[PDB]
Amino acid sequence: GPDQRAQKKGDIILGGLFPIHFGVAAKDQDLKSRPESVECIRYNFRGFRWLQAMIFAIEEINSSPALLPNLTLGYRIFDTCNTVSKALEATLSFVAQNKIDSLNLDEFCNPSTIAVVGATGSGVSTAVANLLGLFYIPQVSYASSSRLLSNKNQFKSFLRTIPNDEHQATAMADIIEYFRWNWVGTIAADDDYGRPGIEKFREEAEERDICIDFSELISQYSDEEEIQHVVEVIQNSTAKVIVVFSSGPDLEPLIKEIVRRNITGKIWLASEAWASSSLIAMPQYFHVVGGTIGFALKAGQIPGFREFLKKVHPRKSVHNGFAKEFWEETFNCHLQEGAKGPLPVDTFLRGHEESGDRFSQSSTAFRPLCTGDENINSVETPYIDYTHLRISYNVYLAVYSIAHALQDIYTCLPGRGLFTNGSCADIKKVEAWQVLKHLRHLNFTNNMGEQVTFDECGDLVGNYSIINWHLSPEDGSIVFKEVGYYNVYAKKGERLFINEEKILWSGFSREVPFSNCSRDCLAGTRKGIIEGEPTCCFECVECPDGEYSDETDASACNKCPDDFWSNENHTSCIAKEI
Amino acid sequence: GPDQRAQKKGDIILGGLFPIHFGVAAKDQDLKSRPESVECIRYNFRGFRWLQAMIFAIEEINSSPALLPNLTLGYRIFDTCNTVSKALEATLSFVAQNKIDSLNLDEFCNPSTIAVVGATGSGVSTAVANLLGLFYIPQVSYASSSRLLSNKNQFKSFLRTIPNDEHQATAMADIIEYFRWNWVGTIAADDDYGRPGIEKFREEAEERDICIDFSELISQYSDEEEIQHVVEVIQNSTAKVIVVFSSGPDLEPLIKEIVRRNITGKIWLASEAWASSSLIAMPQYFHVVGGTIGFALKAGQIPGFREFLKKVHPRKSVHNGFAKEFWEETFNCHLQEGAKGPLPVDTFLRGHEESGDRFSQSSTAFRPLCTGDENINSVETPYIDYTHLRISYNVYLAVYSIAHALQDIYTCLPGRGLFTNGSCADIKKVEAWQVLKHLRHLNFTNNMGEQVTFDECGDLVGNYSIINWHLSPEDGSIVFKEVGYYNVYAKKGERLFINEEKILWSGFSREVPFSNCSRDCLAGTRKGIIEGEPTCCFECVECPDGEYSDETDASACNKCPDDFWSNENHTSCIAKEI
Ligand SMILES: *[C@@H]1O[C@H](CO)[C@@H](O)[C@H](O)[C@H]1NC(C)=O
Ligand SMILES: *[C@@H]1O[C@H](CO)[C@@H](O)[C@H](O)[C@H]1NC(C)=O
Ligand SMILES: *[C@@H]1O[C@H](CO)[C@@H](O)[C@H](O)[C@H]1NC(C)=O
Ligand SMILES: *[C@@H]1O[C@H](CO)[C@@H](O)[C@H](O)[C@H]1NC(C)=O
Ligand SMILES: *[C@@H]1O[C@H](CO)[C@@H](O)[C@H](O)[C@H]1NC(C)=O
Ligand SMILES: *[C@@H]1O[C@H](CO)[C@@H](O)[C@H](O)[C@H]1NC(C)=O
Ligand SMILES: *[C@@H]1O[C@H](CO)[C@@H](O)[C@H](O)[C@H]1NC(C)=O
Ligand SMILES: *[C@@H]1O[C@H](CO)[C@@H](O)[C@H](O)[C@H]1NC(C)=O
Ligand SMILES: *[C@@H]1O[C@H](CO)[C@@H](O)[C@H](O)[C@H]1NC(C)=O
Ligand SMILES: *[C@@H]1O[C@H](CO)[C@@H](O)[C@H](O)[C@H]1NC(C)=O
Ligand SMILES: *[C@@H]1O[C@H](CO)[C@@H](O)[C@H](O)[C@H]1NC(C)=O
Ligand SMILES: *[C@@H]1O[C@H](CO)[C@@H](O)[C@H](O)[C@H]1NC(C)=O
Ligand SMILES: *[C@@H]1O[C@H](CO)[C@@H](O)[C@H](O)[C@H]1NC(C)=O
Ligand SMILES: *[C@@H]1O[C@H](CO)[C@@H](O)[C@H](O)[C@H]1NC(C)=O
Ligand SMILES: [Ca+2]
Ligand SMILES: [Ca+2]
* Top-level class of domain B167-297+462-502: alpha beta
Classify each residue of B8-18 as buried b or exposed e, where b means 16 or more C-beta atoms within 10 Å of its C-beta: bebebbbbbbb
Cβ(A553)–Cβ(A521) below 8 Å: yes
Report resolution in angstroms.
3.1
CB contact under 8 A, A44 and B349: yes
Please give the helix or strand (H or E) that residue B59 lies within, else none.
helix B45-63
Using CA atoms of A479, A481, A487, A493 in order, give the dihedral in degrees to the nearest 10: -120
Distance of CA A313 to the CA centre of its chain: 30
The DSSP 8-state label assigned to residue B513 in this structure reads P
Q: Are B7 and B76 in contact (CB under 8 A)?
A: yes
Pick the CATH number of A167-298+463-502 from 3.40.109.10, 3.40.50.2300, 3.40.50.300, 3.40.710.10: 3.40.50.2300
User: How many Å apart are CA B22 and CA A349, to the nearest integer?
Assistant: 8
Contact B119, B125 (CB under 8 A): yes
Name, in order, each residue with C-beta under 8 angstroms of A105's C-beta and a sequence gap of 6 or more. none
Q: Cα(B347)–Cα(B341) distance, rounded to whole angstroms?
A: 13
Other C-beta atoms closer than 10 Å to the C-beta of B451 total 11
Residues A225-247, buried b or exposed e (16+ Cβ, 10 A)? ebbeebbeebeeeebbbbbbbbb
Q: Kindly state if the Cβ of B445 falls inside 6 Å of ligand 12.
A: no
Taking the C-alpha atoms of residue A155 and residue B519, their distance in angstroms, rounded to an integer, is: 88
User: What residues does A8 pair with on adjacent strands?
Assistant: A75
The answer to whether residues A351 and B279 touch, using CB atoms and an 8 Å cutoff, is yes
d(CA B376, CA B432): 38
Give the CA angle between residues A39, A51, A74 to the nearest 5°: 105
Distance CA A144, CA A117 (A): 11
How far is it, in rounded angstroms, from Cα B72 to Cα B13? Answer: 9
| 3-state SS assignment for residue A310 | helix
**Closest CA to ligand 3's atom 7:** A262
Which amino acid, residue A165? D
- The shortest CB-CB distance from A42 to any of B26, B363, B381 is to B363
CB-based contacts of B292, cutoff 8 Å, min separation 6: B267, B268, B269, B270, B275, B468, B469
DSSP-H helix ranges across B428-543:
432-440
Which ranges in A298-390 belong to alpha helices (H)?
305-310, 322-331
The identity of residue A47, as a single letter, is G
- CA A98 – CA B115 distance, rounded (Å): 77
Element counts in chain B: helices (H) and strands (E): 14, 24
Query: What whole-number distance in Å separates Cα of residue A562 and Cα of residue A323?
Result: 93
Q: Looking at CA atoms only, how far is residue B288 from chain A in angstroms?
A: 16
Q: How far is CA B562 from CA A263, B114, B547, B576, in A?
A: 127, 87, 11, 10
The residue nearest atom 5 of ligand 6, judged by CA position, is A450
Measured in residues, chain B has a length of 578
Give the phi and the psi of residue B186 in degrees, each rounded to 5: -120, 140
B345-349 long-range CB contacts below 8 Å, 24 or more apart?
A: B345/A45, B345/A380, B345/A381, B345/A382, B345/A385, B345/B369, B346/A44, B346/A45, B346/A46, B346/A278, B346/A382, B347/A278, B347/A279, B348/A279, B349/A22, B349/A42, B349/A44
CATH topology of domain B1-24+38-160+389-461: Rossmann fold (3.40.50)
Return the number of other C-beta atoms located less than 10 Å from residue A83's C-beta. 21
The per-residue DSSP string of A434-446 comes to HHHHHHHS-EEE-
The DSSP secondary-structure symbol of A514 reads P
Percentages helix, strand, coil for chain A, rounded to the nearest 5? 30, 20, 45
Closest CA to A344 of B75, B187, B381, B557: B381
Q: How far apart are CA A545 and CA A525, in angstroms?
A: 12
Closest CA to A195 of A158, A146, A161: A146
Chain centre distance of CA B147 = 13
User: What's the CA dihedral at A488, A489, A492, A495 to 10 degrees?
Assistant: -60
Disruptive mutation site among A42, A380, A471 for chain B (greatest number of B CBs within 10 Å): A380
How close A348 gets to chain B, by Cα (Å)?
6
DSSP notation for A519-566: PPP-TTEEEEEPSSS-TT-EEEEEPPTTEE--SSS-SSPEEPPTTEEE
Crossing angle of helices B167-178/B194-207, nearest 10°? 40
Closest CA to A78 of A124, A35, A110: A124
Q: Is B474 annotated as a binding residue?
A: no
Whole-Å CA distances, A223 to A220, A257, B352: 9, 12, 21
Where chain B is discontinuous (C–N > 2.5 Å), the residues before each break are 110
How far apart (Å, rounded) are the C-alpha atoms in residues B265 and B251?
Answer: 18
Cβ–Cβ < 8 Å for B520, B534: no
Going by C-alpha positions, the residue among B225, B12, B242, B241 that lies closest to residue B112 is B12
> Which residues neighbour A78 within 8 Å (Cβ) at sequence distance 6 or greater?
A1, A2, A4, A5, A6, A16, A17, A18, A86, A89, A90, A93
**CA A430, CA A12: separation in Å to the nearest integer?**
8
Rounded CA-CA distance B462/B162 in Å is: 8
Q: Identify the closest residue of chain A to B345 by CA–CA distance.
A: A382
d(CA A309, CA A381) in angstroms, rounded, equals: 12
Phi-psi category of residue B196: left, alpha or beta, with phi > 0 → left and psi -120 to 50 → alpha: alpha
Nearest ligand to the C-alpha of residue A453?
A: 5
Spell out the residues 6+ positions from residue A373 whose beta carbon is closer than 8 angstroms to its own. Answer: A340, A341, A342
Q: Which of B259, B327, B346 to mutate to test the interface with A (most CBs of A within 10 A)?
A: B346
Question: CA-to-CA distance for B52 and B86, rounded, in angstroms?
Answer: 20
The C-alpha atoms of residue A397 and residue B465 are separated, in whole angstroms, by: 61
Determine if the peptide bond prior to B375 is cis (ω within 30°).
no
The closest alpha carbon to A281, from A293, A273, A289, belongs to: A289
Distance, CA of B115 to CA of B128 (rounded, Å): 12
Q: What is the three-class DSSP state of B381? A: coil
CB A182 within 8 A of CB A238: no
CA A182 – CA A240 distance, rounded (Å): 11
In DSSP terms, A547 is beta-bridged to A559
Residues 6+ apart with CB under 8 A from B468: B291, B292, B293, B294, B480, B481, B482, B483, B502, B503, B504
Of A343, A378, A476, the CB nearest to B341: A476
Give me the DSSP letters along A447-485: TTS-EEEB-SSSBB--EEEEEEEEE-TTT-SEEEEEEEE
Burial of A155 (0-12, 13-18, 19+ CB in 10 A): buried
Rg (CA), chain A: 30
Which of B257, B258, B262 for a ligand 10 pocket mutation test, highest count of atoms within 8 Å of Cβ? B262
Rounded CA separation A58/A70 (Å): 14
Cβ of B385 within 8 Å of Cβ of A344? The answer is yes
Alpha helix segments (H runs only) across A104-241 = 122-132, 167-178, 194-207, 224-236
Interatomic CA distance for residues A266 and A250, integer angstroms: 19
List, as own/partner pairs, every contact residues A445-453 make where C-beta atoms lie below 8 angstroms and the sequence separation is at least 24, other chains included.
A446/A397, A446/A400, A447/A302, A447/A396, A447/A400, A448/A300, A448/A301, A450/A298, A452/A161, A452/A397, A452/A400, A452/A401, A452/A404
Is-contact B363 A26, C-beta < 8 A?
yes
Largest CA distance in chain B: 121
Which among B10, B191, B189 has a CA at the least distance from the CA of B111? B10
If one counts every other C-beta atom within 10 angstroms of the C-beta of residue B192, the result is 15
Distance CA(B313)–CA(A242), nearest Å, equals 39
How far B95 CA lies from chain A's nearest CA (Å)? Answer: 25
Minimal Cα–Cα distance from A404 to chain B, Å? 29
Element (H, E) at B195: helix B194-207
Ligand having the closest approach to the CA of A485: 6
8-state DSSP, A342: -
> What are the helix and strand counts (H, E) for chain A?
14, 24
Distances (CA, A) of B56 to A78, A383, B50, B325, B376: 50, 35, 10, 19, 18
Which helix (H) or strand (E) is A78 found in, with range? strand A73-79
Check A279 against B347: CB less than 8 A apart.
Answer: yes
- Cα(A482)–Cα(A347) distance, integer angstroms: 50
Amino acid at A557: C
| Pocket mutation for ligand 3, best pick of A256, A262, A286, A288 (most atoms within 8 Å of C-beta) | A262
Solved using: X-ray
Q: By the 8 A CB rule, do A436 and A402 touch?
A: no
Residue A468 contacts residue A503 (beta carbons within 8 Å): yes
- A383 in helix, strand or coil? coil
Give yes or no for B339 touching A (CB within 8 A).
Answer: yes
Buried b (16+ CB within 10 A) or exposed e, A552-561: eebeebeebe
User: In the 8-state DSSP scheme, what is residue A149?
Assistant: G
Interchain contact, B353 vs A279, CB within 8 Å: no
Helix (H, G, I), strand (E, B) or coil at A222: coil
Query: If we measure between CA atoms, which residue out of B194, B175, B294, B185 comes closest to residue B251?
Result: B194
Instruction: With beta carbons less than 8 A apart as the criterion, state whether A439 and A404 touch.
Output: no
Q: Where are the domains positioned within chain B?
A: 1-24+38-160+389-461, 167-297+462-502, 525-575
CA distance B250 to B265: 22
Tell me the C-alpha distance between B208 and A406, whole Å. Answer: 84
- What Cα–Cα distance (Å) separates residue A260 from each residue in A253, B193, B381? 11, 63, 39
DSSP state of B165: T
DSSP for B308-341, please give it.
HHHT--TTT-SSBTHHHHHHHHHHTSEE-SS--S
Look up the CATH number of domain A1-23+38-160+389-461: 3.40.50.2300
Strands B73-79 and B12-18: parallel
Question: Environment class of residue B333 by beta-carbon count within 10 Å: exposed (0-12), middle (13-18) or buried (19+)?
Answer: middle
**Selected residues 13-52 of chain A with any CB under 8 Å from a CB in chain B:** 19, 22-23, 26, 41-42, 44-46
- Cα Rg of chain B, angstroms: 30
B368 near B333, Cβ under 8 Å? Answer: yes
**Closest ligand relative to A420 C-alpha:** 4
Q: Residue B486 is inside which H or E element, if any? A: strand B478-487
Ramachandran area for residue A278 (φ above 0: left; ψ -120 to 50: alpha; else beta)? alpha
Closest CA to A48 of A13, A4, A12: A4
Contacts (Cβ under 8 Å, ≥6 apart) of B78: B1, B2, B4, B5, B6, B16, B17, B18, B86, B89, B90, B93
In this structure, the strands spanning B293-297 and B463-471 are antiparallel
Residue closest to A447 by CA, chosen among A170, A67, A124, A127: A67
Alpha helices per DSSP H over A238-361: 248-260, 272-275, 286-289, 305-310, 322-331
Looking at the complex, does the CB of residue B120 fall below 8 Å from at least one CB of chain A? yes
Q: Compute the distance between CA of residue B281 and CA of residue B480 in angstroms, rounded to an integer.
A: 9
Helix B84-95 vs helix B122-132: crossing angle, to nearest 10: 30
Instruction: Determine the Cα–Cα distance for residues B39 and B43; give it in Å rounded to an integer.
Output: 12
Q: Would you call B348 an interface residue with chain A, using a CB distance cutoff of 8 Å?
A: yes
Please give the Cα distance from B353 to A493 (Å, whole number).
Answer: 33
DSSP state letters, A152-165: TTT-TTEEESS--T
Phi/psi for B401 (5° steps) reads -55, -50
Q: Residue of the nearest CA to atom 8 in ligand 1?
A: A180
- To the question of whether residue A61 is assigned a binding role by annotation, the answer is yes
